[PDB]
Amino acid sequence: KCPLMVKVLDAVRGSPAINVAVHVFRKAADDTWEPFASGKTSESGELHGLTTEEEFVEGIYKVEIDTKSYWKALGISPFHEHAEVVFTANDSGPRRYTIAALLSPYSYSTTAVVTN
């Protein structure tokens, strides 16, 4: 199945954070973020299918979540421009990764569930 899944939750409304812009990058030889993958969260708050076992290779990744778009489209003025999660992936055998972010105007938490 999917080596990378993102999940987003709204801490204010107690529900799936639907249609959130999520962008992914892989750090380059030259320290530049190369556009890698892109999408929007489904009904359940879940971006599935971002990449494939093969294409997702050892490196450093930045998952950027467009929290600010979400909050403004609802009429709240957020504190954060976006939410970055920067991590090394695939350096330690073949594994599945799950980013989960829980959103608030002036706050967010992110967590990882990597499976052996």
Partner 1 sequence: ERDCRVSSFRVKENFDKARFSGTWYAMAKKDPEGLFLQDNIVAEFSVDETGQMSATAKGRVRLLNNWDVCADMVGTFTDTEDPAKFKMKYWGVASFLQKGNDDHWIVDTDYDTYAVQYSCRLLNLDGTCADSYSFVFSRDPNGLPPEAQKIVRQRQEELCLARQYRLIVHNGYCDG
Residue 109 known to bind ligand: yes
Give min distance, CB of 69 to partner 1, in A. Answer: 11
Residues 52-91 that bind partner 1 (CB under 8 A): 72-79, 91
Q: Closer CB to partner 1, residue 39 or residue 105?
A: 105
Of 12, 28, 57, 86, the one binding partner 1 by CB under 8 A? 12
Q: Closer CB to partner 1, residue 34 or residue 91?
A: 91
Q: Is the dihedral of CA 112, 9, 43, 85 positive or negative?
A: negative
Q: Does 111 bind partner 1 (CB under 8 A)?
A: no
Closest CA to 6 of 62, 55, 48, 58: 48
Q: Which residues bind its own copies (CB under 8 A)?
A: 9-16, 60, 76-77, 79-82, 84-88, 92, 100, 102, 104-115
